[PDB]
Amino acid sequence: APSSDDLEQFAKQFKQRRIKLGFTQADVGLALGTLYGNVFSQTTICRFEALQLSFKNMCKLKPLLNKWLEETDSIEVGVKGALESHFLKCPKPSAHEITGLADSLQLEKEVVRVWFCNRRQKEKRMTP
């Protein structure tokens, strides 16, 4: 398995080469469908180039992007800041903390619950 440094260098050189070939991020994502039956979105290609995915996600995707390379050659600021503050304190809130913070902050419980799942996921990105 690759180091974080391996994946960083791979990402850099993947991006350089995609741009040089004049393909867009969506182009690559689509071609992974066309060529390998594994379609991906522009969002996914973008995150991969920015290392904004988990280490394991990055590792699963790298060989796929490598094959492609080989071949071709809302919530408001008042609310947000507060949400962030609590996260630094309690990153994993109980369904009561959640429902509690939700109404007090005037948001649906489900919007608050998902915000915390996403915030937790971000921290697990190779570069958050």
Where along the sequence are the contacts to DNA (CB under 7 A)? 29, 39-44, 46-47, 50, 52-54, 56-57, 60-61, 74-75, 80, 92-93, 95, 98, 109-111, 113-118, 120-121, 124
> Between residues 26 and 69, which has the closer beta carbon with respect to DNA?
26
Residues in the chain after which the chain is broken, C→N over 2.5 Å: 73
CA 55 – CA 53 distance, rounded (Å): 7
> Between residues 9 and 121, which has the closer beta carbon with respect to DNA?
121
> Between residues 17 and 55, which has the closer beta carbon with respect to DNA?
55
CA 77 – CA 89 distance, rounded (Å): 19
Min dist CB 69 to DNA, Å, is: 17
Min dist CB 100 to DNA, Å, is: 13
CB 25 within 8 A of CB 49: yes
CA 31 – CA 87 distance, rounded (Å): 39
Min dist CB 3 to DNA, Å, is: 17
> Between residues 18 and 47, which has the closer beta carbon with respect to DNA?
47
CB 56 within 8 A of CB 4: no
Q: What are the residues facing 125 on neighbouring strands? A: 54
Min dist CB 4 to DNA, Å, is: 15
